[PDB]
Design a protein around this ligand. Structure first.
Ligand SMILES: Nc1ncnc2c1ncn2[C@@H]1O[C@H](COP(=O)(O)OP(=O)(O)O)[C@@H](O)[C@H]1O
Ligand SMILES: Nc1ncnc2c1ncn2[C@@H]1O[C@H](COP(=O)(O)OP(=O)(O)O)[C@@H](O)[C@H]1O
Ligand SMILES: [Mg+2]
Ligand SMILES: [Mg+2]
Lengths: 375, 74, 160, 118, 375
């Protein structure tokens, strides 16, 4: 722990938890949001026999544990799970006590207000944090980009959000949430791999196939033409070496998996591709600034490490929108940490401690005070 | 839940620990002897507050010890 | 040599007094006063331990380096100090953790090499190479760069 | 024989360690004394008015209240620390057991017997 | 008897009984599970004329006794036989009274639950043991190896069991029992020796030929090529000196006897070789840990004293499984005592007396209590 009473910066992103100290450039403890529990009961002795398993421990013990998600698309299952994982993060991973450091947290866009009130109340009772602040990840990604104008595409693991912000002002009237995310990607890839001869249901193979998505997946420039040329495609077809050692070969599926977000009709969504969701979002607001939105679009999330989103994005928007002004996307490398960086940025300036949510305000007005203290 | 328990447990503990003075009736000599006694009590409280702070630092050190013993364990 | 006085220092007075007065169970009269090496195993049965051929033969090798076929009293004390490992009737650990706090002078959680060098030179002996090198081999096992409380306890076991 | 040298090195080491323990304890006591002098300065009642001394007694009551509160907060922090100490320590005991439990017990002791008695 | 009330440790292995005290390194009384009975009736006087003969006494009196097996492949014939042999072990061989020492016993894998209930009930009524615990020999061999991950091949004299255990957790869904064991080995060798000109039926020659298996038998590296070169093989052919003094010469049979377990089609089993049984066992469980199972296989049993199981094991598994990761077998010398060693290990720690099966629990809930007290 630093000698100074600097604040805690924790991004509880929908899919990854990244925690550390204020003034740091990158979060120190970063772990996926999976939680493992003992698949069977206790009869043995001498070691183990522990209920909750979180972090890399559960990653190593994936096979023996039922792998469960305490949060999915924002919905909260069991607050005890968050209690334990935050205990682990603060003491076993961050080696910090929350008594002496206020916490800045980031929440998924348009999270329930009742969810905020319950989570804040359990937090304040269970923990002894001196002060509090929670913010939407959209403005955090904006801060990471450091440009007040643009539309943020937050692609988490449970929801994809499109949020327009012009000159550092939120536009909730033109903000939308789409239920397509990593979960859907894994599902669709699971069914295609089932049609390829490999049919698995458990979560270990879920992580294997999301790793495959991280490594080999394409974003098709032209879809049906690329499957037409991918009929044989000995060179274009790509293989992976699974940890057991078998060589699993995939061809068109590499660019037929992310395409589903662009083409939701593959597995039955009324909503069109996410580019349509950015398009409608843009026109909902006044006409004039729309061009700037076209030229200032930002994309954020862990998924963004994949190739192909930028070219597809610009080409389709230019197809939909007039091609007079040039559209260009901006995306700094390793932007999944960017939100946490913005949290540090929030703690950088000396005005931030004017609106810390202190203990006594919550003791006076209950959780309801946040309704007036954040917004 | 536990909202009142924690707060009024703490206030109860600070009530049994501290002593309440009927100051209004206290006589001149009584203000003398008592403000001396109260200042001495604050003196001792700060003394073993400093002791608590130091020993807090060392218990942090042994936390450091044990957590490192844990991380080496893998 | 220094092993004789180190064995003196690492063993309590009552133990060594009983050890010698009980070694005097073999001498009876008109003898040299030093019994043959193999008879030593027998006094060990009196001690309450049940050693084995491997340790017995090794320990046998640990006495009479110059090859006289007989054991003197200083070699007797060093071998005894080298037999039971329960020195200091069980070395403590709590105050020792306080001493662990002592090795560290920056309050980090572990012992730096610079802190060890100043600690060693504070005795009066300077730094030589075999000193710190061997102290590191004794203390560490995997080049972790520090001496934690487990390696702390391990390194000085039995030492007072 | 290098073992003699190493053992006397660590012996002198631990003796100087005990000296440093005594010295650091003395420094802790001195720092406590100076912090006492600076946190609670000498008395102020000489020649004061009784009514003001009423106000002084009430002020010292508030002072003792809040400093007791601060003590409570600090000792609670310590108590959480100690609970984590205990749990982590048990984990240490088991984890050390993993590396050293099957390795210290009898070694051919019973094998030594009368192989001719049968 | 030791002054301390330390527990009894008894391994009633399927083929050998090894009993002793807790805290000891090796069992004190070790005898084969054969039981001899008078082949004829009584007319003489002055000596002998005793019904049950057990242990080395029966070994010396093999010729005069009908040699019978109170247990075969786990099945129990007559509890009176176990009563007598346990009496002999406790009083004539261990010189101990079970009144003052709780007993830790090991049982064959997947032994009948009704067998457990009857044996425990007769035990508790007949004997006065203060407390009880019975465990599967698989975890005992695991404890002897001291590594929580691996698949145990327990090759007893009645059954061969393959049991996978990952991180000290039993996997009954992937556990199998094969009816090939020492009995089969002796039988097959008997028929081959019959084809060699020597035809015996009695048990004395059974022990002679199992001794031959202990001494001279090979495990063929390549089977048909080694009989092809064993056609003449003056050097490769090996001889034995039978106690009567005749020299009996055997060639390819040395490695054609254990091969039957690997090649069951020789005497008609639908199940393939035991390596196939370890292979299927491995794949039944999740894919990922299978590599660790490959690298952590353990073998246990008295048969393991023979050469050739290790090389054959690894080569065939590498043939069946991909050869990326290196497979290595571990087998400490004199591992047939290892189970008993693990029993001592169980009594070593101070938590073991938390779940001793005391007399009063059995008196309250009958034998049925074990259904809740062990598992
Ligand atoms: N290094 C990486 N390369 C590619 N994809 C990644 C990487 N790390 C994480 N991801 C993907 O990001 C997803 C998690 O998104 P996350 O960054 O938590 O969203 P948010 O920005 O809302 O917190 C995971 O499902 C995973 O598939
Ligand atoms: N010293 C030895 N060398 C080779 N084989 C042996 C030896 N001792 C016993 N065996 C074999 O082991 C078999 C008994 O197996 P056992 O160890 O009782 O199985 P378990 O491990 O299930 O108790 C006997 O049939 C015998 O052939
Ligand atoms: Mg995101
Ligand atoms: Mg066996």
């Amino acid at each position: 722990d630093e000698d100074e009473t600097t604040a805690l910066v924790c991004d509880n992103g929908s899919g990854l938890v990244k925690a550390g100290f204020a003034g740091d450039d990158a979060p120190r403890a970063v772990f996926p949001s999976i939680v493992g529990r003992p698949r069977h009961q206790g009869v043995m002795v001498g070691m183990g026999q522990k209920d909750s398993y979180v972090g890399d421990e559960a990653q190593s013990k994936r096979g023996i544990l039922t792998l469960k998600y305490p949060i999915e698309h924002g919905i909260i299952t069991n607050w005890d799970d968050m209690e334990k994982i935050w205990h682990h993060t603060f003491y076993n991973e961050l080696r910090v006590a929350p008594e002496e450091h206020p916490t800045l947290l980031t929440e998924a866009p348009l999270n329930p207000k009742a969810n905020r009130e319950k989570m804040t109340q359990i937090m304040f009772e269970t923990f002894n944090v001196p002060a509090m602040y929670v913010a939407i990840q959209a403005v955090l990604s904006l801060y990471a980009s450091g440009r007040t104008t643009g539309i943020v595409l937050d692609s988490g693991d449970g929801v994809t959000h499109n949020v327009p912000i012009y000159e550092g002002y939120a536009l909730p009237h033109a903000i939308m949430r789409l239920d397509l995310a990593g979960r859907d990607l894994t599902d669709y890839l699971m069914k295609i791999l089932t049609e390829r001869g490999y049919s698995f249901v458990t979560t270990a193979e879920r992580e294997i196939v999301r790793d495959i998505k991280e490594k080999l997946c394409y974003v098709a420039l032209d879809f049906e033409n690329e499957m037409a040329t991918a009929a044989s495609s000995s060179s274009l077809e790509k293989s992976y070496e699974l940890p057991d050692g078998q060589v699993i070969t995939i061809g068109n599926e590499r660019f037929r998996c992310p395409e589903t977000l662009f083409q939701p009709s593959f597995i039955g969504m009324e909503s069109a591709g996410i580019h349509e969701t950015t398009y409608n979002s843009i026109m909902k607001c006044d006409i004039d600034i729309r061009k700037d939105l076209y030229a200032n679009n930002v994309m954020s999330g862990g998924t963004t490490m994949y190739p192909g989103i930028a070219d597809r994005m610009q080409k389709e928007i230019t197809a939909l929108a007039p091609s007079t002004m040039k559209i260009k996307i901006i995306a700094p490398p390793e932007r999944k940490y960017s939100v946490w960086i913005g949290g540090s940025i929030l703690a950088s300036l000396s005005t931030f401690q004017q609106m810390w949510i202190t203990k006594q305000e919550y003791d006076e007005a209950g959780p309801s005070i946040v309704h007036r203290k954040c917004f | 839940g536990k909202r009142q328990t924690e707060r009024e447990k703490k206030k109860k503990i600070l009530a049994e620990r501290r002593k309440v003075l009927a100051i209004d009736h206290l006589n001149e000599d009584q203000l003398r002897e008592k403000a001396k006694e109260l200042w001495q009590s604050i003196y001792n409280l700060e003394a073993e507050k400093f002791d608590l702070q130091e020993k807090f630092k060392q218990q942090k050190y042994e936390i450091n010890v044990l957590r490192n013993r844990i991380n080496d364990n893998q | 040599d220094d092993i004789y006085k180190a064995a003196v220092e690492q063993l309590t007075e009552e133990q060594k007094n009983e050890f010698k007065a009980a070694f005097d169970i073999f001498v009876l009269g008109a003898e040299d006063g030093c019994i043959s090496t193999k008879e030593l195993g027998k006094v060990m049965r009196m001690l309450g331990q049940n050693p084995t051929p491997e340790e017995l033969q090794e320990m046998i090798d640990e006495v009479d380096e110059d090859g006289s076929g007989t054991v003197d009293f200083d070699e007797f004390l060093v071998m005894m100090v080298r037999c039971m490992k329960d020195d200091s009737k069980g070395k403590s650990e709590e105050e020792l953790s306080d001493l662990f706090r002592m090795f560290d002078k920056n309050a980090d959680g572990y012992i730096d090499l610079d802190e060890l060098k100043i600690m060693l030179q504070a005795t009066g002996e300077t730094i030589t190479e075999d000193d710190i090198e061997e102290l590191m081999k004794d203390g560490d096992k995997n080049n972790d760069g520090r001496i934690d409380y487990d390696e702390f306890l391990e390194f000085m076991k039995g030492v007072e | 024989i290098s073992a003699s040298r190493k053992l006397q090195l660590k012996t002198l080491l631990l003796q100087i360690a005990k000296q440093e323990l005594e010295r650091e304890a003395e420094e802790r006591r001195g720092e406590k004394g100076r912090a006492l002098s600076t946190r609670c300065q000498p008395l102020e009642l000489a020649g004061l008015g009784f009514a003001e001394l009423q106000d002084l007694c009430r002020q010292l009551h508030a002072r003792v209240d809040k400093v007791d509160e601060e003590r409570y907060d600090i000792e609670a922090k310590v108590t959480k620390n100690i609970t984590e100490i205990a749990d982590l320590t048990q984990k240490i005991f088991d984890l050390r057991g993993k590396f050293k439990r099957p390795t210290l017990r009898r070694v051919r002791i019973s094998a030594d017997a009368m192989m001719q008695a049968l």
